[PDB]
Amino acid sequence: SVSKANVPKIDVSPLFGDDQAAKMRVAQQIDAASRDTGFFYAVNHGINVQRLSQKTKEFHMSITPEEKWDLAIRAYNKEHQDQVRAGYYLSIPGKKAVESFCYLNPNFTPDHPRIQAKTPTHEVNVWPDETKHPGFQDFAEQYYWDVFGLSSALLKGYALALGKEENFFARHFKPDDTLASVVLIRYPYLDPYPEAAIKTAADGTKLSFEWHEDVSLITVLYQSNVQNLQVETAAGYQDIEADDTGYLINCGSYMAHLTNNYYKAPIHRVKWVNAERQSLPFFVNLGYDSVIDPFDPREPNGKSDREPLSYGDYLQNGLVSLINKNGQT
């Protein structure tokens, strides 16, 4: 069997308060986890994840095929040319088992300057009919802000961990402009489970999603309590334990770029499991024009030979590349 990955549980509650020394002790834990497997569980995070799961299940189990077409992104519905990121990602029974619903910043409204400009990666969210899904949009928008708040706290810990002031990332992570996304992914139980919907790794492991690094600064994930993720390490792919009270945190490739791989974006993959479950990531993205000068916390003078990259350039290029590599979700 594969060995268990070292995924420590870190109590992040000090990151919400004003005890600077305690924040440093959290930052050290983040540093250690980021230098090791690249994953940790954030605990004492303050979010009601059980309610998140319940509301998400009520949505996934009640939405109809009709509504899925009507919410579909462009990849599934040519009539919806503005929906590149936000909307419904359909399953293809017999071929693609997973389905999902993505939404973006609720502040991306029709009058937002980036929406008026039609700037890439910005879109106005689409939502199902309120009468068919009472309370869902309100719940989902509030969840965006709850996980935004946790993410801001986590970003203060990553900044302190890297030797920076606590707002070093967080000053570029703003309610009015963040490109962050929530994805409500449904993995189904299927009997029989179609082989075409199961991928196979070079080591023989059955997978739902192949190896990748995340397109994010950090990723802040709630999943059901069903083991499925693996992380590549020196010792091969290792299993990340489940814990559906904590949030699983890892860095994405923008952090790797900014830190000159001090905090790598861990390569990870999703095992095939025949289970009805949920995967609810929040991809922590900055603003379109956010640029942080790359640095190197292993170099005496802190300098890096990487060029600055705006977050919008990073994101637009990354999302396309991930689809080309691992397929349209």
Ligand SMILES: C=C(C)[C@@H](NC(=O)[C@H](CS)NC(=O)CCC[C@H](N)C(=O)O)C(=O)O
């Ligand atoms: C555990 C996870 C976080 C999930 N992974 C994915 O489905 C992949 C790789 S993390 N995610 C994406 O395809 C990126 C989605 C970006 C989003 N659709 C957007 O527009 O922001 C999974 O469960 O499969």
Ligand SMILES: [Fe+2]
């Ligand atoms: Fe990922």
